[PDB]
């Protein structure tokens, strides 16, 4: 009933600590939509916040080691700026035409999720990406989809699906803390007492795309 569902799924992620809500934000109606439509918003948010931090975790490591792509990106010839040698500075030193089109790419991917399928505030389920081939609001068909383009997951039964989402939730919750924890070490020395020195300091206000 969109409330028994949120309690039951947080229960399956943790026997003890069943349904945790101190600020009591799981009771709002947002803009003014029905409570059931809203709880879908809070869920679809938490997944989307958990998906990037999982992706930014693995991204943060590959930026640090030097598994950079070995060529130049631009037509004129300047290579990938792994010279700056640290993942926030590596995102600093780009061009006036690469930093856009990465956001502009994701800006199509974010957008395509509202249209082209059943919206999460009208039923459905949060974080469910609709396939490109099933919708008509695209001129040319792309070859493969975004999630699981090789079709492994369709052989798995339903009990391994709902159990799979909950493993994504808790890993999504852990990775949001990992990225933030990497942020605080960058801007505050000794912000967390595990990593003594692996980060350069760089007071560069990373929350801004375009300096």
């Amino acid at each position: 009933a969109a409330k028994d569902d949120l309690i039951a799924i947080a229960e399956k992620s943790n026997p003890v600590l069943k349904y945790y809500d101190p600020l009591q934000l799981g009771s709002t109606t947002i803009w003014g939509e029905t409570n059931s439509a809203t709880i879908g918003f809070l869920r679809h948010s938490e997944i989307k916040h958990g998906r990037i931090a999982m992706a930014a975790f693995v991204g943060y490591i590959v930026q640090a080691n030097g598994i950079h792509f070995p060529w130049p990106m631009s037509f004129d010839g300047s290579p990938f700026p792994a010279d700056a040698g640290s993942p926030p500075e590596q995102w600093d030193a780009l061009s006036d035409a690469a930093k856009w089109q990465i956001i502009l790419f994701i800006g199509f991917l974010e957008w395509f999720s509202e249209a082209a399928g059943k919206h999460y505030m009208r039923g459905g389920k949060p974080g469910a990406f609709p396939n490109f081939s099933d919708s008509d609001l695209i001129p040319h068909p792309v070859p493969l989809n975004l999630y699981d383009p090789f079709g492994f997951s369709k052989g798995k039964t339903e009990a391994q699906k709902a159990d799979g989402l909950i493993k994504e939730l808790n890993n999504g919750r852990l990775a949001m803390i990992g990225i933030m924890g990497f942020l605080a070490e960058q801007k505050v020395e000794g912000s967390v007492p595990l990593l003594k020195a692996v980060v350069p300091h760089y007071d560069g206000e990373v929350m801004a795309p375009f300096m």
Binding site: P15, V16, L17, P193
Partner: protein
Amino acid sequence: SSAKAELEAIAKKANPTLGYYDPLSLADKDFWGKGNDATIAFLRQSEIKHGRIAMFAFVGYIVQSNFVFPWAQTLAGAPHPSADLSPEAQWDAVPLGAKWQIFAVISALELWDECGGGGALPHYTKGRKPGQYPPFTLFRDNVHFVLDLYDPFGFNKNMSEETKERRLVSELNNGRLAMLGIFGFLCADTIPGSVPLLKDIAIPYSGQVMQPFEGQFSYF
């Protein structure tokens, strides 16, 4: 007054001569507006917790006065604390990150009494006896084996309800001795000449015995 009569019965079984010592009768009402039942079993659990820590600090005090570990404390340098010197200041010689891992362990391990262990046993007012413990059996069947607290290999299975009560009162009166046991050690090691026969003091004081962090972490 069932909760009062449970406190009076165990006070007779601890000392039938002196009986019911109540020089403040604060075990018949409310502190936080929550209940006479909510007050007594909070104080019963309190005194139970005070003596369990106390006994664990008498045995811990003697051994640190006696032979203490060799072979290394930390990664780099590894100076072990002192052997003869006062255990109260052997606590101060423990390094920084060693201590914060101890208190973080004490915070979560003790917390498991409060929730009752994922439910299945209520909070200390009702149901459980004061000082009982939800036996880890929510954490242990989902990730790994951490055995159990206070019963690592449990041979404590089969006892009469009459025979447990002799051991229920062994928790109190030994700990009531162990509450004032420590104070005799701990007043002696800061001020000269208050203890009758204990002139085995380490020769300086301790230094703020209510300080977890005397070195390098001080408030302003």
